[PDB]
Amino acid sequence: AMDQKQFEKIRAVFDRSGVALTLVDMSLPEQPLVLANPPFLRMTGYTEGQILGFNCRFLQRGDENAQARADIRDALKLGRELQVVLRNYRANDEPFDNLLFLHPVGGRPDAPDYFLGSQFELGRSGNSEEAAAAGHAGALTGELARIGTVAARLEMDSRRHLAQAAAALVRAWERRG
Amino acid sequence: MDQKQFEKIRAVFDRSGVALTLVDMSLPEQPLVLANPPFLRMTGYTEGQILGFNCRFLQRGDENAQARADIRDALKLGRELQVVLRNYRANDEPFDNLLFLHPVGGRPDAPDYFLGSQFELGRSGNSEEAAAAGHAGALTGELARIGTVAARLEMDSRRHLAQAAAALVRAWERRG
Numbered sequence A: 001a002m003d004q005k006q007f008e009k010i011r012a013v014f015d016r017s018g019v020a021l022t023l024v025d026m027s028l029p030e031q032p033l034v035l036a037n038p039p040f041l042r043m044t045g046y047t048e049g050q051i052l053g054f055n056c057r058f059l060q061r062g063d064e065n066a067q068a069r070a071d072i073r074d075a076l077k078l079g080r081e082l083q084v085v086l087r088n089y090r091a092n093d094e095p096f097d098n099l100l101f102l103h104p105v106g107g108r109p110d111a112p113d114y115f116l117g118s119q120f121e122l123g124r125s126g127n128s129e130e131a132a133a134a135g136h137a138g139a140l141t142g143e144l145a146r147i148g149t150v151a152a153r154l155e156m157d158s159r160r161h162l163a164q165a166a167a168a169l170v171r172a173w174e175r176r177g
Numbered sequence B: 001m002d003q004k005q006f007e008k009i010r011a012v013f014d015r016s017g018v019a020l021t022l023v024d025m026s027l028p029e030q031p032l033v034l035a036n037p038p039f040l041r042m043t044g045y046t047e048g049q050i051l052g053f054n055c056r057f058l059q060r061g062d063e064n065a066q067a068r069a070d071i072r073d074a075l076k077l078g079r080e081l082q083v084v085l086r087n088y089r090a091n092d093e094p095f096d097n098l099l100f101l102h103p104v105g106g107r108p109d110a111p112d113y114f115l116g117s118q119f120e121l122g123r124s125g126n127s128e129e130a131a132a133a134g135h136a137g138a139l140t141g142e143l144a145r146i147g148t149v150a151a152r153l154e155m156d157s158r159r160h161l162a163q164a165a166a167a168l169v170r171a172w173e174r175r176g
Ligand SMILES: Cc1cc2c(cc1C)N(C[C@H](O)[C@H](O)[C@H](O)COP(=O)(O)O)c1[nH]c(=O)[nH]c(=O)c1N2
Pocket: A022, A023, A024, A031, A055, A056, A057, A058, A059, A060, A069, A070, A072, A073, A076, A086, A087, A088, A098, A100, A102, A115, A116, A117, A118, A119
């Protein structure tokens, strides 16, 4: 029940964004990537053409994020937001930790038509991982509000909770050693 | 200046989820020319109640001498600055303002405008740093839209601003 016009608005927001953005079709269980912006493409080292149609787990290897994935599947089925860290791999197979922000888009409250994903690459920010992650959270919420997934009046409150959630996750991630 | 570019700034201002202000550098007293709804909501004034005036009404005379010195230098230089001001709402409630300053377009050392973005400190419990860094992240997005932050070196621009914001917060907490 989503206007071709909204889909295009989302595409335009992805294209101009300063954070990695992905969109996945929820109308089918294989859940293919349907949008993926330039910063996601550079972080991972793929091209847009080779990525679309695939499920985003192609960034993973085997059975590696068992906990994080079980959480992701629930969020998705329950149509809820989620932040989780994931062990991921670029096209060249180097490992990287991906702080993943998930957000339901469109559809109905417990049946979103799409899911948005935004990736924050950990370990690139040195002494200020919390701040960087939180900064990312802020730019994200701005994108969410422009699309309309976050209510405009609630953009601030959303940002504050998402930034906090990101800093916490970083802190637990640097508690892993 | 420009009619197309000023219209864009007005547009970005109206939609935004961050407190935004635009000051006209071409006027003797450097007055508010734009003031967006989350700014008005934070301070409790209306558009008409504050437009055309300089933002120094949020202060009570002499309380931010060092900071306003840093502000005047920045404005003269046309450089960015992040600074904490003691401020007062329309109902005279006091709050500390973490103020973000940015030069808008024009000339590198004499800009057409300054963009101010206010972040209220002390309403974020144990995660002031996170919330400030979040604010900086959102701001940078708006600056990238206006055109001030070029391209998508926005990311590194975001990371630094967020780093700076968090630092300023820590200092402000080392000052009980
Ligand atoms: C919008 C969006 C974006 C992403 C994902 C999901 C969605 C909906 N997923 C998760 C992946 O697609 C898959 O759901 C999880 O691996 C769990 O499902 P499985 O346990 O593999 O069946 C994901 N996976 C990953 O390893 N890195 C990521 O950044 C992406 N981003």
